[PDB]
Amino acid sequence: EFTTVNVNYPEGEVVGVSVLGIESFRGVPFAQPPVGNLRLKPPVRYTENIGTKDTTGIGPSCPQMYLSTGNGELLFQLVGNLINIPLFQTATLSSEDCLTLNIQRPAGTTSNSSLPVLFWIFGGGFELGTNQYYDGIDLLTEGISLGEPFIFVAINYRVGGFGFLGGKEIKADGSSNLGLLDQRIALEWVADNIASFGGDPSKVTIWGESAGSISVFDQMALYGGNNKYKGKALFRGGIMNSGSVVPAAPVDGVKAQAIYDHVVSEAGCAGTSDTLACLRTVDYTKFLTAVNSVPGIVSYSSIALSYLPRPDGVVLIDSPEEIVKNKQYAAVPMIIGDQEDEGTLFAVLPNNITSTAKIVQYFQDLYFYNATKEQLTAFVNTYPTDITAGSPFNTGIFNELYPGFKRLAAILGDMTFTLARRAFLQLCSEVNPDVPSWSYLASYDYGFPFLGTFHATDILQVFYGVLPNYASGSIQKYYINFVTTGDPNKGAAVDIQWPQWSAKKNILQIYATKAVIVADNFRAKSYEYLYNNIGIFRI
Ligand SMILES: *[C@@H]1O[C@H](CO)[C@@H](O)[C@H](O)[C@H]1NC(C)=O
Ligand SMILES: *[C@@H]1O[C@H](CO)[C@@H](O)[C@H](O)[C@H]1NC(C)=O
């Protein structure tokens, strides 16, 4: 029940597969393979035709730092069933030769079509992940069925030490934040070539979850908020699922230099004249071992990440909170939301962090090098020790995995995602009052034991078809409405108007079988501290 289909475009030709009404091209190379003397260097566009490429398979993935299985034993039991969510899946066909994207479109789409584009950036803690497990067929089919067809694009970008390695050596070589540059260059590729595929390059909406979501903000922030390529905006809209501003110390800071020095040592490049140059001569396997030898996300250190975007003064010019405050990001219409219990997943492992003093130490040692004990204690004291006050929110005496679990999960979730979001909306509304934004809180997994509506459960609600509930149809319709009209309420009919955030500072709360509108003001004292002292929270 299928056929192949060729697209000829300015850089080459691809063969894709048409099945179930969707034409898919997986593994379209968008930049030169970052190998040899191009490992730990910015991506560079192809300078000549790549001939005819077979894109009927699944593409490659970038090198991975897979979740610790010895460490996550309990965590992976607690998610049970939902272990089949992409974040927990294992990437296949991994390689340094991974700078490729996937293009999926309605059958019938030709180069005379000009459909809106939806550009997807995966999450994975900046250390793992791939576009392989995010297929557009169900979502495209939904789009088509709403009378609102579009084109789906999903990219790989380098992660871990391959993409976010730092230090003074990386900074001087101009090789900071390669993963971000990978995302950016794919946007410019899209700008050059998507018309050949039937996309309208002036109608690009970027979309991400977790690390991908944070990346979406960074793409707005990139180059002082210059998202223009050849005179034109690279995108017109953003959707942020769990994550935005991540205040951070410089790429040549202490944390990053320590990672770097450790990597050099484990690579066997210690004490050479030019360490960074030497890193590129190391075999792939010895190198992969080096960059993976540092702490992962499933570990005691948890969301004190080893790899992430850090200010370099060119790509990211300042720490993210300052970029907004200085009105130096590309201000586009945006949707941003959180799962209700963002922190739960990350509070599972550190099961000895069981009191205020212990939370504060943990933070002082691993997280915030610029906060004082009095400051951290003051912030932690905005969170009651009472078992009913924590995350999974609104579950009373239940879900206390260990003494202090719900409190720590509340804190971890709030500062990284949920309250950081409100801060972001607040600031954006202050410098760019005219740029509209919409925000939701997700609660459709209320009751999930110990985890509640936890990080990445939204994936299940938008990538796997329209589920037999309220939430998935609701969410997909808003998203597709947005991609099409720049406003989630405009397009296909909706049964509740989603309020613009800046109007009354209300958000949409989405349950499994209904939606309600609520004030974005819960945990106000915690939020006030965070907003008033955001500088001290630089990771
Ligand atoms: C928690 O336990 C770990 C490993 O057992 C240790 O590294 C860390 O220092 C401990 N922190 C506290 C506050 O006990
Ligand atoms: C700490 O604050 C200072 C003041 O500018 C800054 O130079 C330094 O990079 C900051 N470091 C961290 C880890 O926040």
- Show me where the domains of the chain are located: 1-539
CB 114 within 8 A of CB 196: no
CB-ligand 1 contact for 18 (6 Å cutoff) = no
Burial class (CB within 10 angstroms; exposed 0-12, middle 13-18, buried 19+) of 444 = buried
Catalytic residue among 94, 210, 391, 443: 210
Atom number of ligand 2 nearest to Cα 538? 14
CB-ligand 1 contact for 402 (6 Å cutoff) = no
CB 149 within 8 A of CB 237: no
Q: How far is the CA of 300 from the centre of ligand 1 (A)?
A: 8
Atom number of ligand 2 nearest to Cα 248? 14
CB-ligand 1 contact for 300 (6 Å cutoff) = yes
CB-ligand 2 contact for 388 (6 Å cutoff) = no
521's tokens: 């003001």
C-alpha closest to that of 240 among 122, 348, 334, 103: 334
User: Is the peptide bond preceding residue 392 cis, with omega within 30 degrees of 0?
Assistant: yes
**Which string of b and e fits 82-119 if b means at least 16 CB within 10 Å?**
beebbbebebeebebebbbbbbbbbeebeeebbbbbbb
CB 66 within 8 A of CB 128: yes
CB 170 within 8 A of CB 257: no
d(CA 291, CA 289): 6
Question: Angle at Cα 156 formed by Cα 456 and Cα 186, nearest 5°?
Answer: 120
CA-proximal residue: ligand 1, atom 1 (nearest): 352
> 3-class DSSP state for residue 308?
coil
Atom number of ligand 2 nearest to Cα 254? 13
Q: How far is the CA of 163 from the centre of ligand 2 (A)?
A: 23
CB-ligand 2 contact for 534 (6 Å cutoff) = no
d(CA 149, CA 151): 7
CB-ligand 2 contact for 421 (6 Å cutoff) = no
DSSP string covering 8-45, please?
Answer: EETTEEEEEEEETTEEEEEEEE-S----GGGTTS----
Residue among 370, 375, 536, 537 whose CB has most ligand 2 atoms within 8 A, to mutate: 370
319 is catalytic: no
Atom number of ligand 1 nearest to Cα 362? 13
Residue reference for tokens 């600031």: 427
Q: How far is the CA of 361 from the centre of ligand 1 (A)?
A: 10
The ligand whose atoms approach the alpha carbon of 349 most closely is: 1
d(CA 250, CA 411): 24
CB 317 within 8 A of CB 426: no
Task: Express the helix, strand and coil content of the chain in percent, nearest 5 each.
Answer: 35, 15, 45
CB 96 within 8 A of CB 17: no
CB-ligand 2 contact for 369 (6 Å cutoff) = yes
Atom number of ligand 2 nearest to Cα 535? 14
Topology given in CATH for the domain delimited by 1-539:
Rossmann fold (3.40.50)
